[PDB]
Amino acid sequence: NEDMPVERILEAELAVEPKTPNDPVTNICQAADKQLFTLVEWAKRIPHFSELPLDDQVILLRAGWNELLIASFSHRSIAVKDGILLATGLHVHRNSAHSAGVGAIFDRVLTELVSKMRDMQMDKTELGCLRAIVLFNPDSKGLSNPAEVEALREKVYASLEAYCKHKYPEQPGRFAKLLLRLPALRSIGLKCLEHLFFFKLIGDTPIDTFLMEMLEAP
Amino acid sequence: EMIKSLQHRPSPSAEEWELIHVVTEAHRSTNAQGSHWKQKRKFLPEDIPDDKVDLEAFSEFTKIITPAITRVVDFAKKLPMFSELPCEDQIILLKGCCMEIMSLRAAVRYDPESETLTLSGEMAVKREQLKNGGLGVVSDAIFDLGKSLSAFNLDDTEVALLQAVLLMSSDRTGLICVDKIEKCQETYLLAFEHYINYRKHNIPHFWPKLLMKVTDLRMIGACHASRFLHMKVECPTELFPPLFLEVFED
Numbered sequence: 439n440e441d442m443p444v445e446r447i448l449e450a451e452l453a454v455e456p457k458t459p460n461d462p463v464t465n466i467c468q469a470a471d472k473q474l475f476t477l478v479e480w481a482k483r484i485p486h487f488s489e490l491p492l493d494d495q496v497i498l499l500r501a502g503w504n505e506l507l508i509a510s511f512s513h514r515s516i517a518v519k520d521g522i523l524l525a526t527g528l529h530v531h532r533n534s535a536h537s538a539g540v541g542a543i544f545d546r547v548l549t550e551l552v553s554k555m556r557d558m559q560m561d562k563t564e565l566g567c568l569r570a571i572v573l574f575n576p577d578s579k580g581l582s583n584p585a586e587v588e589a590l591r592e593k594v595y596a597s598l599e600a601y602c603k604h605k606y607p608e609q610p611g612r613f614a615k616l617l618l619r620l621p622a623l624r625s626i627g628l629k630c631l632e633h634l635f636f637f638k639l640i641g642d643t644p645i646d647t648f649l650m651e652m653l654e655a656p
Numbered sequence: 657e658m659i660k661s662l663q664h665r666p667s668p669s670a671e672e673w674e675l676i677h678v679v680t681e682a683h684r685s686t687n688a689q690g691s692h693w694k695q696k697r698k699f700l701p702e703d704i705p706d707d708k709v710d711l712e713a714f715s716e717f718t719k720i721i722t723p724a725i726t727r728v729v730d731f732a733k734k735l736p737m738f739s740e741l742p743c744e745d746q747i748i749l750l751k752g753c754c755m756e757i758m759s760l761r762a763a764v765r766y767d768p769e770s771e772t773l774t775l776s777g778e779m780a781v782k783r784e785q786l787k788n789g790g791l792g793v794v795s796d797a798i799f800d801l802g803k804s805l806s807a808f809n810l811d812d813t814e815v816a817l818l819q820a821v822l823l824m825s826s827d828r829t830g831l832i833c834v835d836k837i838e839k840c841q842e843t844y845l846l847a848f849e850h851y852i853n854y855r856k857h858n859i860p861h862f863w864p865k866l867l868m869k870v871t872d873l874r875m876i877g878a879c880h881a882s883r884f885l886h887m888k889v890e891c892p893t894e895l896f897p898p899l900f901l902e903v904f905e906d
């Protein structure tokens with residue numbers, strides 16, 4: 439039942455997340471670089487992540503970093519009206535996004551992610567779990583034994599479903615309402631990555647060390 | 657307790673069976689070839705892109721695609737909480753989910769002995785054939801889902817309910833009913849969960865394992881849109897049926 443403890447997962451979230459240039463695209467890139475450090479910390483603090491081969495740990499984090507970071511900033515922004523809150527304490531607004539041309543994907547984030555997490559009042563335990571389900575992706579190319587990864591993902595499905603039924607018995611379809619936020623994140627995360635490479639090539643947007651390392655081959 | 661507790665993993669709570677039945681039949685009537693799709697199976701003769709579109713295989717698709725989109729419309733029409741939706745709001749939902757439902761409808765008719773999907777229940781096509789005829793790498797994506805969904809042993813109700821879920825996405829651009837559409841999906845999911853509990857599949861974690869396929873479908877949709885733009889370059893817009901243009905152009 440708890441071969442993946444929701445409390446151990448919620449703890450990872452709290453261990454990295456605290457309590458609540460000019461170019462928005464550059465500011466977001468700065469935030470992303472800082473968070474790539476914290477991301478690996480959070481990852482190691484998730485049950486059984488550190489037990490996988492070191493190359494697999496990399497494979498998984500290299501694969502889901504975008505979606506993970508997107509989810510994490512989107513949940514922090516639940517308060518932040520019409521805009522997004524960065525890990526650098528900075529705020530980026532809908533209008534400023536449009537000015538940078540990035541208004542289309544930004545509107546998608548605010549709507550499909552922030553709004554939906556806000557409307558449903560998504561807690562940090564569920565967030566952690568969704569992020570953990572994204573982390574544990576067996577479909578990732580090159581991992582030595584994906585069955586271990588798949589098993590760990592299945593372990594999160596179980597624990598998250600269990601927590602949902604326990605903490606929210608009134609909401610009988612909360613667990614599916616949460617899982618259905620993942621197609622939106624997969625879709626959004628993919629377009630954000632495209633823009634990132636488009637901005638990486640133009641050269642005009644300054645991408646820091648870790649973010650760069652993600653945007654290049656290993 | 658124990659007894660009070662052992663009323664866990666529920667089955668469809670009465671009204672849910674009315675819903676299950678309306679939808680199961682909405683999909684049953686709209687699923688082109690019914691119980692005789694294996695019997696009425698017409699293999700496409702060996703003629704087969706990632707663009708460089710094989711117009712001979714593309715033509716056979718453009719033929720059958722006009723009724724296919726229509727069925728995806730018919731099914732939605734029959735669902736009462738959809739029928740009750742505004743002019744705009746229900747066209748946005750119909751545009752967004754069209755290809756998802758079509759791919760899902762195609763993927764469920766995959767047979768591994770022959771390595772073929774069955775378009776509109778009439779035409780059986782191979783991986784190379786669907787690719788070269790305009791779908792390109794979207795073909796592999798549909799084929800791979802057909803392999804993946806085979807283990808799930810989905811039935812007419814499962815499919816019908818998945819279709820209703822794909823249709824009721826509150827995460828589409830420019831929606832005004834919103835919560836009205838969101839609660840429609842909420843009800844349909846709850847029923848789908850219960851029907852799944854009732855079905856008792858030989859698969860552990862079936863419900864989440866299934867719901868994750870929504871991403872695969874959502875992605876088959878998104879790639880189709882880009883794959884359509886590449887078709888538009890490689891064409892003639894006159895080759896595209898007006899309905900196909902209605903759904904996909906914009």
Ligand SMILES: N[C@@H](Cc1cc(I)c(Oc2ccc(O)c(I)c2)c(I)c1)C(=O)O
Nearest residue numbers: 717721724758761762775776777790791
């Ligand atoms: N088979 C489904 C309906 C369905 C019909 C056809 I033609 C299909 O192929 C496509 C679709 C879009 C395209 O642009 C091209 I080029 C080919 C698929 I995938 C599905 C059913 O049974 O309802």
Ligand SMILES: CC1=C(/C=C/C(C)=C\C=C\C(C)=C\C(=O)O)C(C)(C)CCC1
Nearest residue numbers: 469470473507511524525540630633634
């Ligand atoms: C390339 C790009 C984007 C990608 C951002 C990504 C991939 C991560 C952001 C992480 C942050 C912002 C972390 C944090 O604050 O903790 C978005 C669409 C959002 C803005 C414009 C273009």
